[PDB]
Amino acid sequence: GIPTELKPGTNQFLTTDDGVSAPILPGFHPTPPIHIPGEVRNLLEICRVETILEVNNLKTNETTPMQRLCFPVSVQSKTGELCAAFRADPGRDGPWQSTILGQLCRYYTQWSGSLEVTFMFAGSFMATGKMLIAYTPPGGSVPADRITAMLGTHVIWDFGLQSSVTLVVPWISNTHYRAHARAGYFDYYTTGIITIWYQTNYVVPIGAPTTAYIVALAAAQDNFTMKLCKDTEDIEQTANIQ
Amino acid sequence: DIQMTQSSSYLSVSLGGRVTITCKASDHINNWLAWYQQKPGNAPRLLISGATSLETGVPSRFSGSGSGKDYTLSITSLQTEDVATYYCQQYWNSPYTFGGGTKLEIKRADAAPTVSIFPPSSEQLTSGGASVVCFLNNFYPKDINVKWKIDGSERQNGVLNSWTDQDSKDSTYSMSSTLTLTKDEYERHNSYTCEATHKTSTSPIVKSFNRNE
Amino acid sequence: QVQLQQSGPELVKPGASVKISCKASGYAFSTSWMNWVIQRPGQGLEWIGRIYPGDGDTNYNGKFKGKATLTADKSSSTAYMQLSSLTSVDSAVYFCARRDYGYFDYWGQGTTLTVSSAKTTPPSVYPLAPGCGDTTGSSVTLGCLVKGYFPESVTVTWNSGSLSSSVHTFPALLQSGLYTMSSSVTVPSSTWPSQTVTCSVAHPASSTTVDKKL
Amino acid sequence: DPIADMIRSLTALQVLPTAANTEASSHRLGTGVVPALQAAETGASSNASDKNLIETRCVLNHHSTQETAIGNFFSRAGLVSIITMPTMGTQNTDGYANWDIDLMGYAQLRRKCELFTYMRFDAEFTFVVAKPNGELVPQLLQYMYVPPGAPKPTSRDSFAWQTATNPSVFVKMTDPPAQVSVPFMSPASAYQWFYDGYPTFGEHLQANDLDYGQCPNNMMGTFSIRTVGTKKSPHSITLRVYMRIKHVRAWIPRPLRNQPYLFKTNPNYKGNDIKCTSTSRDKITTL
Amino acid sequence: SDRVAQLTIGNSTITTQEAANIVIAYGEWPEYCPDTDATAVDKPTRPDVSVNRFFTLDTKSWAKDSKGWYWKFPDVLTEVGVFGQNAQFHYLYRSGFCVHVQCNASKFHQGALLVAVLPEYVLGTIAGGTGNENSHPPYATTQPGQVGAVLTHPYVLDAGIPLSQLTVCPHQWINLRTNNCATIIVPYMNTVPFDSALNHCNFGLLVIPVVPLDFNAGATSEIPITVTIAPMCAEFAGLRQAVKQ
Amino acid sequence: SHENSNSASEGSTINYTTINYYKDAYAASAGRQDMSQDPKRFTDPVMDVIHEMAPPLK
Ligand SMILES: CCCCCCCCCCCCC/C=C\[C@H](O)[C@H](N)CO
């Protein structure tokens, strides 16, 4: 018949090749589709949904795991005190593991874009406070003062009727994309820290409770992308699923 | 102005026991209470901060608690270097009010007073002033009242008592009661009698003296 | 190690003024409050005022506003308290404490201040010995009275420091503007008057160390 | 006319081949316009852009959003079964083996499919046979798709191997693996990986309580494997099947599982070893 | 201009002074089943004012250690009203719901709730506390009724999926300094156009306190939570005698 | 000379051009995927429109 020659790649099974296989049922016709709500077409639609960040990931909270979703604020005695600090890379081990952005970034290798963090205040109406939420590009470690942490991208938050503020994390990076940071040589993809400070104080009248809690939410912006699908290390099968 | 009451000012338990020092406030102080210990002579030392936390260096015999407006410092068990005055402090509002102070003492058996009156020397009222004294020695416990008795008559004021705190290894108390007097009214009367009445004892322990002896 | 070292004792006339120092060491001095606590003898402990040596502001108690005034010198790391219009109720011990988280974590040594117009008097040793009429019984205590001395106090010893198992040094209690103390020693009658006792006063202010035997 | 009373979406689809650009901005100092302050209680995510908070540049992004699609997230072949015919042993010593079609027994493909509630796709199965050694010997096999209600094989010499209507495929061991395409075969419009309900009526006891969660719409039959011959072959066969998702639609995204799996039919977790979603640290003020 | 609202369906109105906005779940309103999606051939019934009204369930009690509650739909209304009778006489069912959750407190209290709608909420079991025993949840747990049920481990929602990612589902918070209501309009979400009301539970309401309730010693400690629900565009098919279970 | 449209996506095909050599459309390739998004029914499913620069409620 036709003269042909076979090349390398014959009789291999690559698990990702997009081929045409032979059918098993000639004349089949599937069940007609109906309008099921909530259809999804990219995974970037789900990465833009705010989910709860676990800033309070302590070793003392692992027996009562519901406390990891909240950080307490209180009436202070010193002025300008550090409240919490956490890194801003979604694919690293830490507070970003509880988010749907973090759990879907670990299915990919590289990422690029801006992130937003929304802090909600769950205190009383008679409470009054101001906080400073800062973001520091890579360099040294966490600062010791807020006179050092004010030199970065910072947002002055005032409590009131609008009980949420949004801190954006800008895309400040050397490269166009950014692989996932670890403790080693892959730490030239670090994104920096996010610190919360007391701007003035947390002030309550008599009768109001002197400790309130803040829940943190995190999602992605519109210029967020992902690249190079991989397999997560968050799922681990040990023996067998009966 | 948050008045902070510490009752009572004296309490006494022996070694190896359990002390409980209470401190009650008037307004809500938000667990911002601190406990101090002051040995006689030196500066206060902070023991508890925030009514729960220990400072770095104090032992685990101290442990504080409290909820509401009443608070508690507990020493289990009491050693001999832990006998001092204990203060509570409120740092929630200004002025930072301290408590009254609960002195600790040692609990042991009772001892009767030994009253020993001494007459005036002859050479000292030659300057115009005499001074009569009523020493008593080595008794326990403290809250008594010694009465001065001249020919069946009540005479105060003019008197002064000077106690002492506990001695070292035997836990006993002493007192010196003297009074100055110009020497012309020294010859008003003749007797020298001091009644030192006690709490349980019905009759006082009395010695006497006279000039015409 | 952080330590606070105050000035020594003072003694001034009624109506004068003093300046108590309190030197801090081993600490960032301009970024922490420095307080002052008064202890009147011998029952209380009360706050006076605090100072932030960085900007220099001061917060006083209400019942010490016109009497005390506070400054601070950061070139020497030294606080100062100037008490003015000093009276007889201003005789107490003045402490210097620093504030860490609302509480006073480190304290000074404690300077003392007495306000009196009396000048240094030599003491008078008057014996208290039995006795023309009563000696009963086989054990009798004996002491010696000391009156008329300023400032407090004197160190009264017995038999060149050989008697310590029977001594009772009593604290002073001033009257008519001048101090007064006493002592006591118990002896059995088998050693009295075999042991003629030796009272020995020692007042280093007036340099008057007179003795007395019985 | 005599009786008077007898006589809507929110959003719009948009094609976006690239990530959005960032326009240039300057400083604003005003009153009445607070883009940072949001309201998280309304259920809406924060719509504050990066240009409404800092002083930005003009960046023309050419970053493509194609690899984040559902059709490229699921078009990777994952393992779904391991069918084993041992010569000695307990499982399938007599030359044939049956396996009920439940594609949810290996955890990596399960956690990806369970991001959504409903999915409607076409499949592609690949059959990789070898010995347990990894070696290959010349032996002819037969796989057969047995639909529900069809007779299942009971031996190597059953009548069910006539393959009069059932689809089957004859393969050696030394040739390339066998690929087949399977359509969407459910009697409903989509597969349910989560069915909150009982498939039948009836008074529910504790005895007939292992049917909570069992939808009959995902019951798809049996793969029947055999070594073709009345005699027995002196060879052990282990077969691994790999499924690849094609032509996929998906609805209703879900939270993603953080506990280890226990069973194929129900999401029972271990209660004394409830592991945490995030790795812990010592203090909240340190990194 | 946004805090006040009125919701009038049937002969029932709900007025609120300090509420947030209304969430339409997945951007779609409740519809009737069109002719291109209907597979049955009978004529479905439509009682539009007797079953499309607000129904108030049992009030709960919020404490400082409360774990959280859940309800199942339409299981909460298969014994209540004329909706419960049409759910007993008919084999098929299709409806959408309004869900309204109320909790009043003072300006001196604090707390936060998370009211979510999870479609196809299959529960799990602790597997005997060791993983070896294959337990299945009982019928009083899987279909609790008008009373609802409590969550045992709210961090994993009694199903092995976290609370931290519950907000991908349609949700509202109840922050006691901001609002006292939460309103979600849910469309009919199922694979088939009609399904049975006694066997299948479509979604599950889920009220979980993420930030605990705390007041001062002396204030009111009786702070209740109540749930009112309203079916929208409800239709039934397949008439027969009454089956209760 | 045409083909049986029996894939799992005809009226809602997420692709544009595929390859086929059989008469059954469920045998075809996956092809290039469409890049259509409607993210606002997960990020803001709120009844009245909330302007960003204005506050949502007051
Ligand atoms: C001759 C080769 C025959 C190959 C036949 C394979 C048919 C498999 C069809 C795929 C069905 C999709 C999986 C459906 C449901 C899930 O497994 C459920 N979780 C089971 O409960």
Residue numbers in the entry:
A (entry chain C): 1 to 242
B (entry chain G): 1 to 213
C (entry chain F): 1 to 214
D (entry chain A): 2 to 8, 18 to 297
E (entry chain B): 10 to 254
F (entry chain D): 12 to 69
What do the study's own words say?
Coxsackievirus A16 (CVA16), a member of the Enterovirus genus within the Picornaviridae family, is one of the major causative agents of hand, foot and mouth disease (HFMD) prevalent in infants and young children. Like other enteroviruses (EVs), CVA16 is a nonenveloped virus of ~30 nm in diameter with a single-stranded, positive-sense RNA genome of ~7.4 kb in length packaged in a protein shell termed capsid. Specifically, CVA16 utilizes cell surface heparan sulfate (HS) glycosaminoglycans as its attachment receptor, and human scavenger receptor B2 (SCARB2, also known as lysosomal integral membrane protein 2, LIMP-2) as its uncoating receptor. Cryo-EM studies show that 9B5 and 8C4 target distinct epitopes located at the 5-fold and 3-fold protrusions of CVA16 capsids, respectively, and exhibit differential binding preference to three forms of naturally occurring CVA16 particles.
